[PDB]
Amino acid sequence: SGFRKMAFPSGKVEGCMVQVTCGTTTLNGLWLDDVVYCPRHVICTSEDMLNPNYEDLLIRKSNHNFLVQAGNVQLRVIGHSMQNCVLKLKVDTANPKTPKYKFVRIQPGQTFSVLACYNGSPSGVYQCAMRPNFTIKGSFLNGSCGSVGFNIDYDCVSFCYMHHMELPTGVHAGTDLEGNFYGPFVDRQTAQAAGTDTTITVNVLAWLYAAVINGDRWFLNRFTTTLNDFNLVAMKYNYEPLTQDHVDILGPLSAQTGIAVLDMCASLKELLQNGMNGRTILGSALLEDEFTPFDVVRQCSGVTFQ
Amino acid sequence: SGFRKMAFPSGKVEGCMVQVTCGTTTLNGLWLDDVVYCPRHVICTSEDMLNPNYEDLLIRKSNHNFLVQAGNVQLRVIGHSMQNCVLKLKVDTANPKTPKYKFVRIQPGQTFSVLACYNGSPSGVYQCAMRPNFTIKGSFLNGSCGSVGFNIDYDCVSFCYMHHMELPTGVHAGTDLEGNFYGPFVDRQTAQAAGTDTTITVNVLAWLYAAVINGDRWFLNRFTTTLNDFNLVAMKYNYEPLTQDHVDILGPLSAQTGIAVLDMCASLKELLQNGMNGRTILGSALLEDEFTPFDVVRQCSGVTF
């Protein structure tokens, strides 16, 4: 029993964190094979960040202007290039602790684990969701840039996030490991604002199934709904539209609990209309939307990573 | 900025997890130097669990009745002893991945990271508090027994918890790594229940200071309180007493924010009286009590390992 915000064990990614220094700017990099990945703004001064020309800034740097530390052991940079908003430093040494890995770009609604790092040392690990406005509600302090987000699937680490910036509301923005930003943001110090955020409907349904599996059933009801009628109500409360694909993905949880997806949709419709009436679900007074259907299955069926 | 329930990186503990099998029972063990630690109930049948005599059950075992697996590597057991409710299996090989470590017993209110494991493989990591009733609100399924709780300071892992059992409310009970149970619990399938749980007051105050540090002050008020008047009110909402020791521990956060401890106590009294009125504090509609004052400082000052 029990249901907790659960991160993947961080060990395989701990092996890959390094410190990258360029001038008086120190942040985190990700060392895989003979390449170190980090945000390209590492080459920028505070004054540079206002209107940076990254091509021109990089053209002026040599390999030896970049100090890479792996624990307290110096890696020699033998090459540098830019892919979109990430810097790739080629180093003389392949990382012996390099795990099996892919670079994956995730969809809004999908979750991942963050290894928060400072000076190339891991501080801590937590679970996050890519919001529909392409931001994450993280815990990052000055020096966290180059901290990575990952999912572990079977034997393989899937890196999906690199941290670049904090927005003025205190939410966070970054890229995939190919340097492509999630959301309509740029790596410049300029007025940038998170768009209006919505609730991740398929995840709230997943979390209601988690509640049922943990013996909390007060919200279930005799009513049903069509997909269309559910979406007409849900959109009024700033909930993402629920697709047929969402319904199919919730198939395994529906089968395990014996509650049809559209019956759980009918339960949610009444919760949105009526509220909770001062009751709670899995120790929360709000409807939680940062657990995916896979997250609920993994934690409720005890899948491990080796 | 931002504030999140944060576990310690689990790498140093991942290196130490093994599978222990005895008969039809498989659970997790902790391999440090040439010893494997696991719950002693590994030597029990389902029938054995109501009134086991562990001295009698253990004296009937040989070294080779214990199958220890570290990945694909069979470890040979060359000895076994019992310390309270943990089994210590002596193995032929010292763990090359053994970190610097200590065995510590924590107090109620203190937090730690859990590496949840099945068949000696890590599933997941989360942050926990030892509740005042000496239980933890974990996420553990059959096979999780021998999963460990830890705090990391510098390079040193301090192991404070081993998982033994699930209570009927769905909360969890276990031991320190000397085999002494937290609370009045025993390793028998006899009926035992969690005592009435209370809110960890000093941690709620710590978390209110975190909210201030992250630029949220809507919940503050013009009032103060005496310690005694705070405790008479907070006990009526099932909150732990706040001691002078608790007040002193909140000293650094009080100094950093310029909000006196008893002023924050006054704020908490009104939050319990009024609720949130459809607002949140650090993205929560409830008052969070699983962050210690040290946890708030660590996460707001960016400490690494």
Ligand SMILES: CC(C)(C)c1ccc(N(Cc2cc(Cl)cs2)C(=O)Cc2cncc3ccccc23)cc1
């Ligand atoms: C390298 C230089 C000059 C040094 C630098 C680099 C990055 C930052 N910023 C601002 C921006 C980054 C992007 Cl990308 C667009 S604005 C940050 O957001 C850094 C940052 C990231 N995460 C959490 C933060 C918390 C506090 C302060 C800054 C934080 C500022 C200076």
Ligand SMILES: CC(C)(C)c1ccc(N(Cc2cc(Cl)cs2)C(=O)Cc2cncc3ccccc23)cc1
């Ligand atoms: C060895 C044998 C038969 C194999 C065995 C060993 C232990 C268990 N128990 C019951 C107890 C443990 C303790 Cl200590 C007292 S009762 C558990 O509580 C296991 C357990 C732990 N954590 C989560 C659980 C969730 C569901 C079911 C059991 C869970 C049952 C069988």
